[PDB]
């Protein structure tokens, strides 16, 4: 196939100006969408704080308005999803991947509103869920919308604009441009066959998305963890030990979410009213735990700098890990709109910090700072649960800027992804697309 390739190499990277320009506008809208979605989620969380003050004396009434405020916002989000867009439940990264396989539709006229407003409800009530899901799905659909509006033709544009949407979408959720592009290249593209996704364009989308986010967010970083210490070579083996711990825990956590989806589906059977009533009990629990023990609730970005700084006791870190594993399953397996990405960072950070603490006390000749082990384990559940280790690495790299930790991060990740493979685990986003594509056939 020599002379074909001779002509193919010659015709390499010449993305049609039409697709390049359309990725430019797609990134800009996904930018504004994620910016607005972010300001929105914050505003309800603030109102919710100011309500607990108008009632800061009658401690039971305090616990009540904390429950009901999140119950109401939760239910609203469940309903908006069951009634008008069922595939905007849960994360939504499984659907955008399916859409790249051409096995699920991009129903943009329905999802943009359902996800955006549905998420504002579940995130804004302080449920343990991430902005990733919402912005990723929302962003891909925004790409289809401009595909349809401008009626561009071809697989290139349909797969590209669908991709450049979800990349710029994950970028704007973490001020994380490189992580976004890498998310498509390692995790979201069609995994078993070639694709025409023009990377130069996904790139133009991520730039514009990131510039919009910088216009509304500069001077404040999502995670400021300072510059930590370096890692001596004779310490690396301790990070691989950490990865092995994640590698067996990774799939163990994947199993629970699948079965917990089942155990919660038994709760409502499929009945839109039992379901929405359940999410008000979940959301109300979260807005309640968010008052009485905030570390067990919320997205989890807040407790990351605190855990890295060694500011928790070892007991507290154990408590938090259990509790946050509990409230993470309750929220994500219920199907409420919102990603799982962000809260898995916290579960990872918390675990590493606990590991770094024990590592500090066993090896004073090593001169450890528990903080480096948090930064390594932060992207670790991403590796052992969703099996996109290269994406978690550049993600944590972008958010904490401790590049001198590049080796223990890479090493703990490969450790988690290898032991997750060898203990019979599956990439979480791909094992969700399955049971979805399998029920979307088992009905026949």
């Amino acid at each position: 196939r020599r002379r074909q390739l001779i002509r193919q190499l010659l015709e390499r990277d010449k993305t049609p100006l039409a697709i390049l320009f359309m990725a430019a506008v797609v990134g800009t809208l996904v930018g504004l969408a994620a910016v607005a979605f972010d300001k929105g989620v914050a505003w309800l969380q603030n109102q919710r704080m100011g309500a607990l003050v108008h009632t800061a004396d009658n401690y039971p009434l305090l616990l009540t308005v904390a429950f009901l405020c999140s119950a109401v916002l939760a239910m609203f989000g469940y309903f908006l999803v069951r009634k008008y867009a069922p595939e905007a439940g849960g994360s939504g990264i499984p659907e955008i991947e399916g859409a790249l396989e051409d096995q699920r539709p991009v129903r943009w006229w329905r999802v943009l509103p359902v996800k955006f407003f549905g998420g504002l409800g579940t995130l804004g009530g302080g449920m343990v869920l991430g902005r990733d899901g919402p912005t990723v799905q929302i962003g891909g659909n925004i790409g289809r919308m401009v595909l349809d509006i401008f009626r561009l033709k071809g697989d290139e544009a349909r797969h590209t604009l669908l991709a450049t949407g979800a990349a710029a979408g994950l970028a704007a959720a973490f001020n994380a441009p490189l992580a976004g592009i890498l998310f498509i290249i390692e995790e979201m593209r069609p995994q078993f066959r070639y694709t025409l996704i023009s990377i130069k364009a996904v790139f133009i989308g991520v730039i514009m998305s990131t510039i919009m986010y910088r216009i509304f967010n500069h001077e404040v970083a999502l995670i400021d963890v300072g510059k930590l210490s370096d890692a001596p070579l004779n310490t690396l083996w301790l990070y691989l030990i950490l990865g092995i711990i994640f590698g067996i825990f990774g799939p163990i956590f994947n199993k629970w979410v699948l079965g917990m989806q089942d155990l919660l589906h038994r709760v409502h059977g499929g009945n839109i009213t039992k379901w929405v009533l359940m999410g008000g009990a979940i959301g109300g629990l979260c807005g309640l735990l968010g008052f009485v023990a905030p570390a067990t609730s919320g997205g989890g970005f807040n407790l990351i700098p605190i855990a890295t700084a060694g500011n928790f006791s070892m007991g507290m870190l154990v408590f938090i890990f259990v509790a946050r594993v509990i409230t993470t399953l309750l929220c994500f397996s219920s199907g409420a709109p919102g990603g799982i990405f962000a809260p898995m960072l916290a579960l990872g950070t918390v675990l590493g910090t606990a590991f770094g603490m024990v590592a500090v006390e066993l090896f004073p000749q090593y001169h450890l700072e528990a903080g480096t082990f948090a930064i390594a384990g932060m992207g670790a559940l991403l590796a052992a649960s969703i099996r996109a280790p290269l994406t978690g690495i550049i993600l944590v790299l972008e958010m904490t800027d401790n590049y001198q930790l590049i080796l223990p991060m890479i090493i703990t990740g490969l450790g988690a992804t290898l032991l997750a493979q060898f203990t019979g685990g599956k990439p979480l986003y791909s094992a969700i697309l399955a049971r979805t594509l399998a029920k979307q056939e088992a009905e026949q």
Partner: antibody, heavy 121, light 107 residues
Framework: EVRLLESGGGLVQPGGSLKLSCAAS????????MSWVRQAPGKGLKWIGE????????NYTPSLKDKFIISRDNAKDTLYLQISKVRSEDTALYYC??????????????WGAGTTVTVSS | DIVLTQSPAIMSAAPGDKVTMTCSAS?????IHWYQQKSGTSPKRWIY???KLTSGVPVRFSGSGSGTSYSLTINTMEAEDAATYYC?????????FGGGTKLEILR
């Protein structure tokens, strides 16, 4: 240059107390651990303790409770050692030192001139 | 903790000449460090990680060994090489120095 200059050493009565000071000049005094090592007259080098830049973990040799108090002032670029209940065993030349590493087995990177603590009545 | 006992407690040797001292440890030790103290001056870090020179240290110096026995050596000695050579470990905690080995010119 990189200079470690320590003062505070003198004559002290037994059971009294002294606070040696180590003054840093030529490098970022944070990001470095510091350490005190004393050398009894005509004897070997002895390790007192060490202290990490954030003052968050201080280690001392197997020696008593409040005997030694290592502390540091990153604003002032200065390292402190307080010896309490001074015996004649504490008569020695006290060295201030900055720590580093290579393969991760740590060493005593750059030392200072020293100060002398005499304990007699 | 880990006792280090340097061997030729005092010793002399003529200039341009091979010298060899020894560090010797009760338990096992990895990568030892060697400092040179001259009468009246701060100790100097001379050799680290079993084998590694420092900037300025002349290449007549060398370290070697393993486990529970290391050593410093001068292929051709000089005059400025007269000092005390202290070995020290941190493979284990807490770290420990040896007794010293005084190197004096022979004449």
């Amino acid at each position: 240059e990189v200079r470690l200059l320590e003062s505070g050493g003198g004559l002290v009565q037994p059971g009294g107390s002294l606070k040696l000071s180590c003054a840093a000049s030529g490098f970022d005094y944070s990001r470095y651990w510091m350490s005190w090592v004393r050398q009894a007259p005509g004897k070997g080098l002895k390790w007192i303790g060490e202290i990490n830049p954030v003052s968050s973990t201080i280690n001392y040799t197997p020696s008593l409770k409040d005997k030694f108090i290592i502390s540091r002032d990153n604003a002032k670029d200065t390292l402190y050692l307080q010896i309490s209940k001074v015996r004649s065993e504490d008569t020695a030349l006290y060295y201030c030192a900055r720590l580093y590493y290579g393969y991760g087995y740590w060493y005593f990177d750059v030392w200072g001139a020293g100060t002398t603590v005499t304990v007699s009545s | 903790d880990i006792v280090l006992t340097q061997s030729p407690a005092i010793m002399s040797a003529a200039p341009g000449d091979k010298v060899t001292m020894t560090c010797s440890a009760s338990s096992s030790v990895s990568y030892i460090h060697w400092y040179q103290q001259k009468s009246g001056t701060s100790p100097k870090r001379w050799i680290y990680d079993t084998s590694k020179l420092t900037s300025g240290v002349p290449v007549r110096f060398s370290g070697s060994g393993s486990g529970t026995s290391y050593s410093l050596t001068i292929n051709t000695m000089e005059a400025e090489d007269a000092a005390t050579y202290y070995c020290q470990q941190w493979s284990s905690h807490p770290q420990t120095f040896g007794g010293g080995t005084k190197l004096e010119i022979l004449r």
